[PDB]
Symmetry: D2
Subunit: 391 residues, 4 copies
């Protein structure tokens, strides 16, 4: 038996909300249900056709049992749908799509949903099990402990990024310029209505209060260009370059894609949006995560036999402005082709979701026949990358 061709038939997401902001009352799983239900509606298929689901989700503590199952059932999918929650840190939402593609390729399923979800607003604090130490204890923040601290270096991802800024000589000003570029591209894309088929509105209902309709990304509107160059370099007191403005923020959101075999799409009279061509994972020293996406992207190109020039648009996840700039520089790519409609620095970074968002964005933004390449670094020194072609 030969490997089956895999197609993206729909790709949908919630808006991204700011930390403790517009979507902070919704658990990650509920955002997941919203995205999954939206993606299935858009695919125009009976929901019973979806055979199995994988969702990325990095910070699972306190979400209750089986987060992906919660998202799936909450979306109204059948109780017969098996569910697995995926954690490759920042790459989780992309790795979910990759693993689901592998199942489809094997003929183990013909239709799946894959994506990612995160509610950083609802990530809790932890207290160790045991006896309390004389003198007190600090209950640790799981965003910091599980999401953002490199285990081996015992420093923030932001501090790890400083290493790359040093080695590649990427200055504060260049990072700030990228960050401003991202906010500008985000606003322009929202104003041009570019997320109209991608984002679905979320109604937040509180008892006794009026409904709030969240219809666009919250983060990009919280910028002051005049203040960008004034911020302190918080991850390194001496010779620092990374700031709160030129790094991604803490956010809430979910994205989901409907994936099928080519045969399943034919059977169901569905016109797919894009073909999944290839994907790869790469890993380097934990401190050097910003550069892993370079290797992952090169693997994919070399596997398919494409040149970098053959890629119409790049989605290189904006964990930090530093990451994108390292990637542009090492790969020598046209910066007008990279994160064209904004990215994590200005739209925000719900870590388990972003890897799925960037792939769904390519699916909508590419023109017929064009190749898009999405890549995303992750805590621990990893990256995932994926090549798709618009149909």
């Amino acid at each position: 038996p030969t490997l089956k061709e895999v197609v993206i038939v729909s790709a949908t997401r919630t808006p991204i909300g700011s930390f403790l902001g517009s979507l902070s009352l919704l658990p990650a799983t509920k955002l997941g249900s919203i995205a999954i239900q939206g993606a299935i509606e858009k695919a125009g298929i009976p929901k019973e056709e979806v055979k199995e689901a994988y969702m990325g989700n990095v910070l699972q503590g306190g979400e209750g049992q089986a987060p992906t199952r919660q998202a799936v059932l909450g979306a109204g999918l059948p109780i017969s749908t098996p569910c697995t929650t995926i954690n490759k840190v920042c790459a989780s939402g992309m790795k979910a799509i990759m693993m689901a593609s592998q199942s489809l390729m094997c003929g183990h399923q013909d239709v799946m949903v894959a994506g990612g979800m995160e509610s950083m607003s609802n990530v809790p604090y932890v207290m160790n099990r045991g006896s309390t130490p004389y003198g007190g204890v600090k209950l640790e923040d799981l965003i910091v402990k599980d999401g953002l601290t490199d285990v081996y270096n015992k420093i923030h991802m932001g501090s790890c990024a400083e290493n790359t800024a040093k080695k590649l000589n990427i200055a504060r000003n260049e990072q700030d310029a990228y960050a401003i570029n991202s906010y500008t591209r985000s606003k322009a894309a929202w104003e041009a209505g570019k997320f109209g088929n991608e984002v679905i509105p979320v109604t937040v209902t509180v008892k006794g209060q009026p409904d709030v309709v969240v219809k666009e990304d919250e983060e990009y509107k919280r910028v002051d260009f005049s203040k960008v160059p004034k911020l302190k370099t918080v991850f390194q007191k001496e010779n620092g370059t990374v700031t709160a403005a030129n790094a991604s923020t803490l956010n809430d959101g979910a994205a989901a894609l409907v994936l099928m075999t080519a045969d399943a799409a034919k059977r169901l009279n569905v016109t797919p949006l894009a073909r999944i061509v290839a994907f790869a994972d790469a890993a380097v020293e934990p401190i050097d995560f910003p550069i892993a996406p370079v290797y992952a992207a090169s693997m994919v190109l070399k596997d398919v036999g494409l040149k970098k020039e053959d890629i119409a648009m790049w989605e290189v996840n904006e964990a930090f402005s530093l990451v994108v700039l390292a990637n542009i520089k090492m790969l020598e790519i046209d910066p007008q082709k990279v994160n064209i409609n904004g990215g994590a620095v200005s739209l925000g970074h719900p870590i388990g979701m972003s890897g799925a968002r960037i792939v769904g964005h390519l699916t909508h933004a590419l023109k017929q026949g064009e190749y898009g390449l999405a890549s995303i670094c992750n805590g621990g020194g990893g990256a995932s990358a994926m090549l798709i072609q618009k149909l």
Copy 2:
């Protein structure tokens, strides 16, 4: 390309420690490193041959960033090794093996490590982010909140088991007899030396203390048969059937398998233990998880045209004695062929590890040519199953 055949080359585990017991000082990821290093040693290959790693791990809160990456780097595997942490609740350890097999089948990697790890001793308590409510703050136990509570029904796994005991007419005395049988078989297998190849010893080292070598599963010795029928039914005080003795326990442990394509096994000239024949996931109504493994096992049998009678050895994970009895009753299989060397009720149940342990046990215990079938229920109403044939 054509789908590649997958073989199990090695299968190794730590002993299983009791809650707050012999292994409680070691993090899940450390147990992971131990199992991973041991499986590579038993496989007789350079660590550098391992291309990618998947580990099941249900309760990831407070383990630090990227648990699987920590296990892999802590075992001395190359920094180039991509890692993904898998959460299908209790089925996590088996699902990791299944997904790794799918990547190998696709020709996306040729050698992987897959397994599961859990340190329930070290799972923390959580406090919600936000304002402290007037009148008190609740610190929830992640074991209870994420591990053991069904989301939809708002009851413990043990109460879901009671539901199945009612519907299938499985009485307290029947569950108690099964549990006693499990304890008996575990002790017999340990005394017969049946885990000599499967289990590797763990050395627990404490500053200014003598070393402690943990060489055997701890839990099976923790029973009093005379008290078994006198114990209170903790999940249902009136007309109950499930007890602390006839349920599985909370435990610490890790297991890891080295998987290869048939081509890689030949290239490297290793002696494969077993071929992976088929695997499947099924899901039912959440409260009914005890029966999900029946459907999952039936799926794998049907997939490859085998009948229940063709199976020499069944590993039906003993989440509760109730579960195994429900499976035997529905499948109508010979109890003498089920969990022959004990299982989770007497050996313990580190949830993210168990699905891998039972596959690994089949790999060592099956005789040449024999088929073994492993199935494992999971929170949310799911199950995974795998069929292997001993080489």
Copy 3:
């Protein structure tokens, strides 16, 4: 019969009372204490160095740091040579502090003292027991509830104890709601008439990179809706209840301080005293019956001095609940127009450690020359303190 030094009040100052998590909530109890103590010494027109010792009531001390009264005193800029003691008689603390200070003065053991009370209920923490966390989790308890508001013996809230007295004395919901509205009315009128001009000192709340807030009046009395009062549900007892969130006192932040001295010291220091402290007493009853303890304490003071209830121009009976005040009016058979005339805790709020000091200070300012004032305050556990003063 002992011959004792005559004790006088030379000043009585307080911060405004802030609402729970409200205007004064960024300020620790000890800081509010410093503000009131400094204000009191300022109004007394004496050197800080003249204050020899300080006692401050403070019910909920957990997490405030070592020696709360010492913090308040040194925080006001008083000499490092000033001995300090923090007093806890629950809700009576602010009064008991004045009483115990008076006793020292009477003995000739000191000639000038500061006495009062402080509480920041906004900043009262939660606790977790020492030891090993039980499998399955734990509820960290709220100290306001555990130490402040729960009767140990009956294992119920103060408000539920009050329901007991409402039953026994036939003090219905409507009468209590009427008393409540009356307190809010009187509080507003007094504030609008400028009746706290010399008693209250404003506090400036400063937050880096924010405008300053000058808190110059009590925050709580403006937080009522008279239309909602009779519609509120009875929180401490659903079945046949009378006590509500509106007719009970609230959780609050504030501090009060008095300069006390011997009559001799006042003369030496050429300051004119406001009032003479005549007598005071403590009484106790069954813990559940705390609302009636102030009746017995007041009667003890009258009997001791040989006065009649009719001789008192002005009564301050702490408004812990509207019920408590009505229960006192009923049993004592006194004229309601002479009781809590410029409002009280039901509308002004109840920072538990300070209220007993506040009400003595208010009598001091409001009484006319030669008039007698009687202040009484119930406390958790079944107790009450009372004090008789005479204006000079």
Copy 4:
């Protein structure tokens, strides 16, 4: 003119044994220890419980003890519901300050019989979490023993680190401190084996369901020492040139003490034999870091007030908060060391902080010979001290 005051006498002084931290009495809350000592004292006094008019108890760490700690102790000892109660906090001086303030009420003729003492269960002191929004990056759970009991607010350092400052200034070395400490343990054991606390201390039965009853009848802390280890121990409060150690400092402990106090007139009316007369007392305060010297000034104040000389004092109880403190006091007052802390103190017996001030007064009451003067003094966090002079009757 000086007021004419009632004479105040100590009629009984009774305490629980002192338990080590998380040791023998750690299952009992402070208030129950309070009840045990209060009932003890009244029984020993030989009066009806209804004769006690009012109660003051010292108690420094009141968090989580429930409403009105003193009221709990009092009602728990079976005293009438008519008995008013006040909980006193002058940190380490609380147990003595309670007796002092009760004495003032008696002097004024405001009461004729009172119970005064102190109680502390440091084993049961909880941790705290602040009310409000959980701050990004972590939430601290503070130990109230550290935060409220042992940390100087102003200097933001442990009491033992403040103690180092005086060791420095007065040149009191490690070995002298250690010498004192061993001296305390020695006196403690001697006194206990001689049966010297036969009337002072009452035994406590600890009942755990399923378990055999435990009878705690002697102080726990003094047996927990190794004299050979003493000189070896690390100086835990200061990195450079330290002198204070876990062994020459007092420990965290649990205990209560209560005294029955009355006017001379009430003792006659009740036909009881008074034990001692309360002569004078004082409080002093210095710079917060300098709390080890504050008892010097407090004692001097008392002697000066009564016109006595240091040489007139038969027996000194200078609370052994730290070995350093007793030494500083001996040095500055120039008194006979053989007259100081004769039967042990807080370094060997332990230091339940709200209790110790009452314990040491109770101890002079039992130890002094007819007509002798005893002086008890006690430092407290914040830079204070209380002192009391008594004469045996």
